[PDB]
Amino acid sequence: MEEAKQKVVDFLNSSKFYFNDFTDLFPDMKQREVKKILTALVNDEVLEYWSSGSTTMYGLKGAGK
Amino acid sequence: MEEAKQKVVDFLNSKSKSKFYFNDFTDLFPDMKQREVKKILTALVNDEVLEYWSSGSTTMYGLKGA
Numbered sequence: 001m002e003e004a005k006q007k008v009v010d011f012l013n014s015s016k017f018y019f020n021d022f023t024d025l026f027p028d029m030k031q032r033e034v035k036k037i038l039t040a041l042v043n044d045e046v047l048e049y050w051s052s053g054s055t056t057m058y059g060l061k062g063a064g065k
Numbered sequence: 066m067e068e069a070k071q072k073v074v075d076f077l078n079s080k081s082k083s084k085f086y087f088n089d090f091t092d093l094f095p096d097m098k099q100r101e102v103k104k105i106l107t108a109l110v111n112d113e114v115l116e117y118w119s120s121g122s123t124t125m126y127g128l129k130g131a
Contacts, residue, residue: 001113009113013130045066045074046113046129060130061114062078 004029004037009046012060019056069097069105074114077128084118084127 001009004026011025023034038058041047049058066074076093077085091102106126109115118125 009129044112044114060128061074062128062131065078065080 005041083131084125087124
């Protein structure tokens with residue numbers, strides 16, 4: 001798959017991570033760009049996300065369970 | 066994803082251990098051919114939804130990260 005998406009899968013495939021923890025890992029990306037990459041992974045069901053506090057939290061599919 | 070692949074995902078995303086045998090899945094899909102079940106599971110592994118394990122004389126599958 002895509003390189004930026006694989007970077008996200010490997011980081012978690014190893015704590016609690018929010019949307020801004022990901023935008024920190026992609027310095028040369030826009031907030032818009034990173035949200036799209038993470039949303040594409042949720043669509044494909046590699047990741048699963050939800051509303052947590054005043055932002056969003058992401059994890060590998062089944063993290064909640 | 067397609068119905069056959071979503072079926073697999075719903076079963077593993079439950080409260081159910083980390084990995085199951087290839088035959089645990091063919092057990093769930095009695096209608097499907099063994100070849101077709103191996104096909105969808107290999108595809109799910111290719112898309113990194115599932116992790117693949119060689120176990121004994123057979124194979125094991127589970128949610129990536131499990």
